[PDB]
Amino acid sequence: DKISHKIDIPDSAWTIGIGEKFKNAGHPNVKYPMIDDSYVQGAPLGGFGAGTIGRTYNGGFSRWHLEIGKNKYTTVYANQFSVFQKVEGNKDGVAQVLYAGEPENGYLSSWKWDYPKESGMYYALYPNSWYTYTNKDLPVQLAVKQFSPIIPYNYKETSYPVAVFKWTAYNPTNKNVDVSIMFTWQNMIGFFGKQVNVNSGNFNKIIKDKSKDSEIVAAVMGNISNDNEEWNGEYSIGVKKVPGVDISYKAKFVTTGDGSDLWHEFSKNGILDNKDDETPTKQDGIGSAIAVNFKLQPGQTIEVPFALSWDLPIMKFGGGDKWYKMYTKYFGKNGKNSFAILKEALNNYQKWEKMIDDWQKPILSNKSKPDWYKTALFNELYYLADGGTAWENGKVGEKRTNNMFGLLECFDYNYYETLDVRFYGSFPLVMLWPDIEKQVMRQFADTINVQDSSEFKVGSNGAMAVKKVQGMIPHDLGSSYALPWIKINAYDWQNPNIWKDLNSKYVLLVYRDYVLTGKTDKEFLKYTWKSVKTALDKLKEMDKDNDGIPDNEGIPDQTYDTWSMKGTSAYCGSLWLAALKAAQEIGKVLKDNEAYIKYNEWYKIAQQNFEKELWNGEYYNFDTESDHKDSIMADQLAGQWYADILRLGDILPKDHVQKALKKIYEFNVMKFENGKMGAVNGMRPDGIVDESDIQAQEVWTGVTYALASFMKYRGMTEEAYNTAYGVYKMTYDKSGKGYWFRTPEAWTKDGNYKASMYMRPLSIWSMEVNY
Numbered sequence: 227d228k229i230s231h232k233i234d235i236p237d238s239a240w241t242i243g244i245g246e247k248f249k250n251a252g253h254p255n256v257k258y259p260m261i262d263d264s265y266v267q268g269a270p271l272g273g274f275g276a277g278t279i280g281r282t283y284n285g286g287f288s289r290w291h292l293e294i295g296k297n298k299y300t301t302v303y304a305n306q307f308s309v310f311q312k313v314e315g316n317k318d319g320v321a322q323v324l325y326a327g328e329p330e331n332g333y334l335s336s337w338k339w340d341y342p343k344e345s346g347m348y349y350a351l352y353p354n355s356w357y358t359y360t361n362k363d364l365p366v367q368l369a370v371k372q373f374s375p376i377i378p379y380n381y382k383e384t385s386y387p388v389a390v391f392k393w394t395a396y397n398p399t400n401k402n403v404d405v406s407i408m409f410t411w412q413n414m415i416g417f418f419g420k421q422v423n424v425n426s427g428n429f430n431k432i433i434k435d436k437s438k439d440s441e442i443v444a445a446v447m448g449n450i451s452n453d454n455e456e457w458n459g460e461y462s463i464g465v466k467k468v469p470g471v472d473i474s475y476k477a478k479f480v481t482t483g484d485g486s487d488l489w490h491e492f493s494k495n496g497i498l499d500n501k502d503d504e505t506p507t508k509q510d511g512i513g514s515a516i517a518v519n520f521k522l523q524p525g526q527t528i529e530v531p532f533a534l535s536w537d538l539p540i541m542k543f544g545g546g547d548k549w550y551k552m553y554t555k556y557f558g559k560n561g562k563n564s565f566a567i568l569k570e571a572l573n574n575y576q577k578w579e580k581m582i583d584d585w586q587k588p589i590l591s592n593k594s595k596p597d598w599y600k601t602a603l604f605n606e607l608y609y610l611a612d613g614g615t616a617w618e619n620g621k622v623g624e625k626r627t628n629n630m631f632g633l634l635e636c637f638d639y640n641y642y643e644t645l646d647v648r649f650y651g652s653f654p655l656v657m658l659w660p661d662i663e664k665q666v667m668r669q670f671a672d673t674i675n676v677q678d679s680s681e682f683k684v685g686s687n688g689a690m691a692v693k694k695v696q697g698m699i700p701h702d703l704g705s706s707y708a709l710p711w712i713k714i715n716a717y718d719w720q721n722p723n724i725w726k727d728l729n730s731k732y733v734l735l736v737y738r739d740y741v742l743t744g745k746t747d748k749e750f751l752k753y754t755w756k757s758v759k760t761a762l763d764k765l766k767e768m769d770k771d772n773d774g775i776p777d778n779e780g781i782p783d784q785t786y787d788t789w790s791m792k793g794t795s796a797y798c799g800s801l802w803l804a805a806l807k808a809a810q811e812i813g814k815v816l817k818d819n820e821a822y823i824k825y826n827e828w829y830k831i832a833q834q835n836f837e838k839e840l841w842n843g844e845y846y847n848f849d850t851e852s853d854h855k856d857s858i859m860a861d862q863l864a865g866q867w868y869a870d871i872l873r874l875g876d877i878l879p880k881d882h883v884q885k886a887l888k889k890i891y892e893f894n895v896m897k898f899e900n901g902k903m904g905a906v907n908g909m910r911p912d913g914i915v916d917e918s919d920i921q922a923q924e925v926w927t928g929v930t931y932a933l934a935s936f937m938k939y940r941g942m943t944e945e946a947y948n949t950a951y952g953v954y955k956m957t958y959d960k961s962g963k964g965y966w967f968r969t970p971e972a973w974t975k976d977g978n979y980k981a982s983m984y985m986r987p988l989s990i991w992s993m994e995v996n997y
């Protein structure tokens with residue numbers, strides 16, 4: 227490996243061999259189907275709300291999130307980079323697709339598949355990833371750096387449906403070598419959203435944009451229709467000329483054939499025919515190819531940038547609504563702008579690289595933090611783009627001030643912005659994209675007094691319940707299968723209108739968002755204040771025994787939605803205390819004296835009673851009335867965690883919090899698989915895992931990272947990182963279960979998972995305490 231020195235891959239990048247098999251992979255062990263797309267994954271490409279494309283460590287473009295809210299895992303075999311190399315004065319060269327695999331059927335059988343093992347590496351540090359190619363039959367070594375411009379405090383480039391592939395080629399031998407790199411792409415118009423004749427009308431064109439000291443050559447893959455529909459738009463691939471390289475192309479090859487129309491050209495001398503052909507297809511799949519060819523002398527290096535863009539302006543949800551995607555603000559709405567996007571990328575990618583470096587540097591340059599922690603911190607951010615992210619720039623055929631936003635909780639449970647989950651999962655948004663975070667919370671504010679008296683069947687017990695109750699915060703802002711932002715509470719396993727955490731978590735989120743953006747956004751507090759008061763006031767009415775605390779009802783009436791709580795619970799009770807303290811503080815900021823006084827009185831009564839009811843000398847009991855009420859819950863003091871973040875001080879005595887955290891570390895972590903897998907949710911005082919519900923026996927990745935944050939705030943540094951380490955290990959390490967770029971909600975002690983691609987573990991950003 228002589229190429230790694232010519233490029234700048236951080237030591238904290240996650241790494242795996244190209245073509246590596248992983249032996250220990252976890253699966254769901256479940257009655258009903260659950261997504262399991264395998265361990266062959268990678269860092270995604272594409273901006274927020276743009277639709278994303280998962281290119282795997284084996285090189286395939288395989289995890290398609292282009293249809294907003296859907297996860298479709300299938301390798302589009304025509305989409306590849308390929309290489310040709312010929313040592314000068316040899317009869318023949320060699321051509322190889324850079325993909326560690328082959329097609330299942332006979333399409334593209336002429337191409338050279340099965341990039342060999344032990345011949346290159348994949349590296350990831352989101353939003354960047356890299357491949358190196360160090361192959362005994364390829365004298366010139368190659369690497370590519372690929373990324374999209376995901377940039378904190380930037381709401382423009384961060385939205386773009388674009389990727390850059392910056393190639394480096396180095397000749398370590400003592401012979402001249404002729405080299406070509408070729409990007410192939412299928413015209414994917416009709417891949418989704420088209421009900422009949424999926425390729426019909428697709429056509430490809432070539433754009434050559436020449437100007438002083440500049441040339442871009444691109445293929446634009448579109449359709450002859452000017453229909454404004456979800457399925458229609460354009461893909462583009464292209465390259466920018468650099469000194470010493472020539473460009474060749476082929477406008478049209480048939481993807482539903484053997485591929486030799488393209489491959490006989492590339493494999494001969496790495497130079498394509500430069501044949502333009504705009505003839506539209508009918509049934510056959512078609513694709514385009516862009517290539518560069520160059521001669522490398524001994525010791526010579528060259529760099530050449532390619533790019534990919536996709537202008538699919540309209541997202542459609544299953545309930546029928548059609549919306550424009552955010553990037554359309556910058557490029558237009560007509561779906562004929564893929565070349566403009568691609569050109570912006572090829573003319574600005576060096577600046578984008580620097581902007582990414584600028585935001586990663588503070589963490590990377592902190593040598594007190596272990597590299598493993600940095601691996602998880604950056605790579606967990608994949609989900610912000612990959613989580614079905616919807617970011618609208620108008621309803622099709624209709625203009626407001628704001629752009630509504632939603633991130634899915636996951637794909638198995640297809641709900642936008644699940645509030646009980648975003649309490650944990652929204653840290654990257656508040657810390658890095660706060661204008662989005664505030665928009666999401668105003669969306670929740672707007673829902674507080676919505677009433678929907680229509681009834682739905684509750685999944686857990688089969689009873690009927692009212693959809694949305696006035697004054698209760700919704701569980702979620704709808705589903706991609708229905709009407710995001712319009713029809714809320716898509717979730718139906720339990721009735722969220724009687725949840726005891728959502729209203730308090732909402733208040734805590736509001737105050738968090740004020741505190742973590744500088745304590746200056748009075749307008750945001752003013753916008754949300756009425757909803758904050760309503761939320762706490764409604765929750766107060768759920769106090770059935772007048773101890774000043776809402777009562778859990780002997781059912782799963784909170785985020786642990788199969789784990790029953792009864793009476794006063796540590797979890798909902800601490801959250802309530804913290805939420806009252808936040809509301810007092812907002813009252814003071816807004817000069818609402820009556821509110822300050824009311825919530826101060828409620829707080830003092832509830833705090834006193836919480837302590838008496840639950841403090842047992844070592845930790846806080848799970849609750850007052852359940853069968854295993856003395857279980858040690860990992861999340862028992864979630865309220866005090868948020869209070870630390872919000873700078874609200876002690877809601878419980880310092881000494882008692884410290885003892886509780888130490889007990890959680892000693893038991894839920896260190897007595898669960900030797901502390902190598904995170905914090906199990908429920909442990910019995912005898913040191914045996916609580917078996918009363920599956921959730922008690924699960925580690926929740928996002929709960930565990932949040933707990934690590936709490937420990938870190940409380941000066942338990944070693945316990946904090948050891949607790950987080952088991953999550954990193956399980957996700958990323960060779961000894962783990964192969965969950966990279968699909969971090970799940972949960973695993974059990976055998977390592978098998980629930981709900982891959984989950985929002986909650988974004989909570990790792992709560993560990994950026996100093997920030």
Ligand SMILES: OC[C@H]1O[C@H](O)[C@H](O)[C@@H](O)[C@@H]1O
Nearest residue numbers: 635639646717785786787971
């Ligand atoms: O795994 C538990 C979780 O399952 C689903 O994501 C529910 O929508 C969520 O509310 C709950 O916390």
Ligand SMILES: [Ca+2]
Nearest residue numbers: 769771775777
């Ligand atoms: Ca009560």
